[PDB]
Amino acid sequence: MNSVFSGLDMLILLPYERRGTRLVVEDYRPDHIYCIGADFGKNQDYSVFSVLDLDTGAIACLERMNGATWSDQVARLKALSEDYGHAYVVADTWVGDAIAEELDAQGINYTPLPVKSSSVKEQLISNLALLMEKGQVAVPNDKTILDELRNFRYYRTASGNQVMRAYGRGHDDIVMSLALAYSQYE
């Protein structure tokens, strides 16, 4: 089969509380270090921010939004960063340059991961899936997160390019957000 996350058996599911748009697994612990994997979506696609607690290896918080302005999205990203001790952002902007200019303007500390190459995407995703297989990924036990992971698939094109995307016309911005966060997991 062409399911990307074959180690879904090993995905750990954590309880959470919905506090607005945030699913919260843990509040900020000052002795821990955090980072945010931020995927940005245009149109129907969602922007998703995932807070990884690097000291624990688990997602502390996840925030999802759809169809807000860039200024709105970045300002929610900022506030998320401040509430997790000025956590560094890994951002996927591959959305135009408008998002980048908003990130710079509001003064966010972030690495733009190109995500403009089949190869780079493969590495992010492969890394997430292998960490999952090893039992080192833990996410809020939420139907929406689990479904995107369950439905993420490999496809082949006529040129032999690999496509990694949701089954059908589903969304995969949660997969990418998670992949960006766990890119910092050691």
Numbering used by the authors: 256 to 349, 351 to 442
The authors write:
The large terminase protein is a key component of the DNA packaging machinery in tailed bacteriophages and evolutionarily related herpes viruses. Typically, in addition to an ATPase domain which powers DNA translocation, the large terminase contains a nuclease domain which cuts concatemeric DNA, generated by rolling circle replication. Crystal structures of the large terminase nuclease from the thermophilic bacteriophage G20c show that it is most similar to the RuvC family of the RNase H-like endonucleases. The overall structure adopts the RNase-H fold.
